DNA sequence: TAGTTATAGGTGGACGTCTAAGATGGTTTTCACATAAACCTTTGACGAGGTAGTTTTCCGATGTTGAGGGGAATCACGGTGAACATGCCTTTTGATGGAGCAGTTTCCAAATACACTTTTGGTAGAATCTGCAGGTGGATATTGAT
DNA sequence: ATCAATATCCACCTGCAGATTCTACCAAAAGTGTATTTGGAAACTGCTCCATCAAAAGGCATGTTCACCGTGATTCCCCTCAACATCGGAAAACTACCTCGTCAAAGGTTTATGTGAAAACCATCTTAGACGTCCACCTATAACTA
């Protein structure tokens, strides 16, 4: 089994990051941009993923569950709807 | 020959997806961004479909929400054009930068 | 016996708040209006949502209200969209709401 | 049998008194479930830490006011509120 | 007879004041402006002395934070001068006016 | 009346200074008294709310201190 | 007598603890003591949630950690998660 | 008799805590480790902006902390300053700090 | 560059509140033995479901080639803010008469805590829905050149 | 100033899935009713600390007038937007397959719920008394022209 994990942060397609630029209003975008964009996503993650896996292991579990997930969303003040 | 000026087929798309509910990423890129970040972190571990698109719909909301006010920092610098120089800005006011 | 939900002739439950409200150890000792007030607090919001989610619904030529017509409810809305600030709902999607400034000539 | 319990069925009655000829997909419904919830813990608590800054201990309809008069916003907060002591007068009344 | 440099005095007292702890408002306009806002909000109400200049520390180091964050928002204009435009863009995406 | 004008413009640029502020139009020392204003008014409304509930009619330190944090402005050095 | 319990008692043991030949103003202590508060309710009501979550019915220093994890950054969590591992295994042990 | 904080090795009240967590409604049941757990991390963390004051009082040529030595120190320090993020301190003041566009010509 | 305005400071002696050592009274906790009540560490075991693994399909991605036009780069020079003044209203910096509101001791109820005793939920378990999720034209705007 | 001509809504209509909509049944809760439990809001009452009005620095308040920074464009250099070409790789079925997270048991802690008896720690300040304000007096670092 296992296959290792390689630049999947890059794998966050120039276009996808577009499309969600356009849906915030976008007309022009830069080259560097979509170096930034990934970089801030990467520490949003982190950050997120972190909390979440905090609660993971402490209810002595080894699944991440959509509730941790969220608990963790909403510790960081970014409630979130439609998950339990 | 047919062809739409410059920054006129850019709008098509933002009153496209202003409309439109949908995740802008694929869910298997994404995928792998989360399992890494998460076992290059804490080694084999587990997510539940949901838990993945959970977090998928938050991130995606989030950067939409951090372009909109990244425009506003474009547009206030009279210029048009997001560049690095207004996330910074946007981020620093918002506080995780300052 | 009479459901203490319909003795307040509310749709939303009266006693399960109640237990809701001990089952939380928000206090030592739960009230006994306390469970009825909040019960219909809630019946009220949800139903003033729901109202607009209706409307939104109609508007986009549907039966079933849908995530989007909760979002274009809450956002379009003046008062929700402050209450609900930090909160994010699943398949949201946004208000159109291009600048004044990117406009074509 | 695993039952967790929530609202749908509520969420539907207060659906069908508003609008009668509507329905609501399943994930609009949780939106919707995860709404009643958080809006619960939120005034819970704000209610929960009143009795506590006042020394006592017990969690009344008058912590819930406060709470409601400081969480909501301008108009909604009096349409609450006026709606809370309508259904607890009945209940005080009706008993 | 001698002149200051215009903006170049202004220096001295951004460090100087940069290095002071102290309230920059006197205790008195202010406590007029919150007895002003309680009254004209709930009839005859008194306060605890500290109570006031809790306020105003409060209300200060907001602004004090506030003006910071508005200062960036000028110099993002390649501008040197805070005006009006500045703190709308600061107060919308701090979210109290977003 | 007017003692949101009480706020004397070099009140106001000083507290710009400290915030490494050089240059200051006009326009801003009544834009300011507006976000002042708004400011205070949010807090002394919840602040009040408190009074109000504790059944008292002075206004305490840890009533401004509690509505400071529910406004998510955690305030320190009046008990709070 | 009105008695009102604050922590500049031991705050100041721990201050002698660091620098022996330094003090602290009145008004340094009241921020210091809202400090202590603030920090202690925090991590408290994290765990005091965690227990829920988690279904669990009593509080154990297990959530305390978690909380702390969660509630305190990067290399100042790892340091606070040591002594109190400490602290807590001299208890166990020097009983 | 032994107080529970020398059980511990600690100058912060064990005994107090427990009793805190009770007249909090925090849980149904509070543990017995937790109060001393918890007890230390605050020490911890009490003495650790303390530890940072204490210099920053001393730079400023003083005895005794007072506010600004306790903002000086947070502000300044990079991981306090983020946990004290949403925080302000009563007369406080703020880190020094002039935007490298404003300074003069040479 | 050398000034000479302006205090960057800068370094040391008494009053002065206002640290903090002390003590004294508690006195309110804090501890420290009681006793089952019950909250939790296994500990099987059974499946959900989450990982991986295989495949066929087409649906976005990437990687060019232009080049319109947006970003900045500098000028005219308008004209908007910062000095450097005295002009003094008013905000400190001090007394002092009671509305409030904490600290006391209380029956009055207004919740806890149980015993059963019917329901209102709630999955589940299908049981049939029947709303809207794409499929191929199709009339219809509005760009962007004739 | 009129004609190409994508891509937009949008018109139906295939059909496919995700609602409700019965029909229970465990059956968890919720509710009925009764003693017990105590938290409260009840009425007193002695004062802390809140608002009264008034002596003299402190710093607010326009005034004058000049020095750079945008309610001016304009240029133009190269940024990245727009077709389009072309597969790589995401998606969208199913197939194992076995890893781990729940339901139930099941003592084994681990905790709470009484209260005598000493042990901090806090009103209560009480009283030394000590660091710091508060500025003299001249250093003395920058500054905007001599």
């Given at each position: 089994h296992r296959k290792v994990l390689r630049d999947n942060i890059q794998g966050i397609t120039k276009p996808a990051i577009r499309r969600l630029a356009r849906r915030g209003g976008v007309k022009r975008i830069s080259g560097l941009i979509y170096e930034e964009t990934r970089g801030v996503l990467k520490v949003f993650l982190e950050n997120v993923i972190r909390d979440a896996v905090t609660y993971t292991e402490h209810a002595k579990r080894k699944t991440v569950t959509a509730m941790d997930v969220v608990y963790a969303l909403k510790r960081q003040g970014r409630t979130l709807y439609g998950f339990g | 020959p047919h062809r739409y000026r410059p920054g006129t087929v850019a709008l098509r798309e933002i009153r496209r997806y202003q409309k439109s509910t949908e995740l802008l990423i694929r869910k298997l890129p994404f995928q792998r961004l989360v399992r890494e970040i998460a076992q290059d972190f804490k080694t084999d571990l587990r997510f539940q479909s949901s838990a993945v698109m959970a977090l998928q719909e938050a991130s995606e909301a989030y950067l939409v929400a951090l372009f909109e006010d990244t425009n506003l920092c474009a547009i206030h610098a009279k210029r048009v054009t997001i560049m690095p120089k207004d996330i910074q800005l946007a981020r620093r006011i918002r506080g995780e930068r300052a | 016996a009479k459901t203490r939900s319909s003795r307040a002739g509310?749709?939303?439950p009266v006693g399960r708040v109640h237990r809701l409200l001990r089952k939380?150890?928000?206090?030592?000792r739960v009230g006994a209006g306390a469970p009825v007030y909040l019960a219909a607090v809630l019946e009220y919001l949800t139903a003033e949502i729901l109202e607009l989610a209706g409307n939104a619904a109609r508007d986009n030529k549907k039966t079933r209200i849908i995530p989007r017509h909760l979002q274009l409810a809450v956002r379009n809305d003046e008062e929700l969209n402050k209450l609900l600030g930090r909160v994010t709902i699943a398949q949201g999607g946004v208000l159109p709401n291009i600048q004044s400034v990117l406009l074509p000539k | 049998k695993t039952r967790k319990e929530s609202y749908a069925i509520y969420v539907y009655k207060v659906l069908k008194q508003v609008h009668p000829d509507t329905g609501i997909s399943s994930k609009a419904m949780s939106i919707m479930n995860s709404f009643v919830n958080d809006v619960f813990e939120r005034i819970a608590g704000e209610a929960s830490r009143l009795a506590h800054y006042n020394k006592r201990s017990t969690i009344t309809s008058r912590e819930i006011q406060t709470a409601v008069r400081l969480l909501l916003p301008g108009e909604l907060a009096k349409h609450a509120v006026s709606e809370g002591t309508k259904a607890v007068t009945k209940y005080t009344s009706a008993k």
């Amino acid at each position: 089994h296992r296959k290792v994990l390689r630049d999947n942060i890059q794998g966050i397609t120039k276009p996808a990051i577009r499309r969600l630029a356009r849906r915030g209003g976008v007309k022009r975008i830069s080259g560097l941009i979509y170096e930034e964009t990934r970089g801030v996503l990467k520490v949003f993650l982190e950050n997120v993923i972190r909390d979440a896996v905090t609660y993971t292991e402490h209810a002595k579990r080894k699944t991440v569950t959509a509730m941790d997930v969220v608990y963790a969303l909403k510790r960081q003040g970014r409630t979130l709807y439609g998950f339990g | 020959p047919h062809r739409y000026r410059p920054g006129t087929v850019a709008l098509r798309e933002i009153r496209r997806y202003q409309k439109s509910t949908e995740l802008l990423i694929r869910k298997l890129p994404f995928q792998r961004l989360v399992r890494e970040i998460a076992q290059d972190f804490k080694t084999d571990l587990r997510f539940q479909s949901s838990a993945v698109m959970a977090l998928q719909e938050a991130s995606e909301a989030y950067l939409v929400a951090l372009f909109e006010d990244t425009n506003l920092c474009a547009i206030h610098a009279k210029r048009v054009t997001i560049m690095p120089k207004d996330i910074q800005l946007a981020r620093r006011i918002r506080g995780e930068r300052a | 016996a009479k459901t203490r939900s319909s003795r307040a002739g509310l749709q939303f439950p009266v006693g399960r708040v109640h237990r809701l409200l001990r089952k939380g150890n928000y206090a030592e000792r739960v009230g006994a209006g306390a469970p009825v007030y909040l019960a219909a607090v809630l019946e009220y919001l949800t139903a003033e949502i729901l109202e607009l989610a209706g409307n939104a619904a109609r508007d986009n030529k549907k039966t079933r209200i849908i995530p989007r017509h909760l979002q274009l409810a809450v956002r379009n809305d003046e008062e929700l969209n402050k209450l609900l600030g930090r909160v994010t709902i699943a398949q949201g999607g946004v208000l159109p709401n291009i600048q004044s400034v990117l406009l074509p000539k | 049998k695993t039952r967790k319990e929530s609202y749908a069925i509520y969420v539907y009655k207060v659906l069908k008194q508003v609008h009668p000829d509507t329905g609501i997909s399943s994930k609009a419904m949780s939106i919707m479930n995860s709404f009643v919830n958080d809006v619960f813990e939120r005034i819970a608590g704000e209610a929960s830490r009143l009795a506590h800054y006042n020394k006592r201990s017990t969690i009344t309809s008058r912590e819930i006011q406060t709470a409601v008069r400081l969480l909501l916003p301008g108009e909604l907060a009096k349409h609450a509120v006026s709606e809370g002591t309508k259904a607890v007068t009945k209940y005080t009344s009706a008993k």
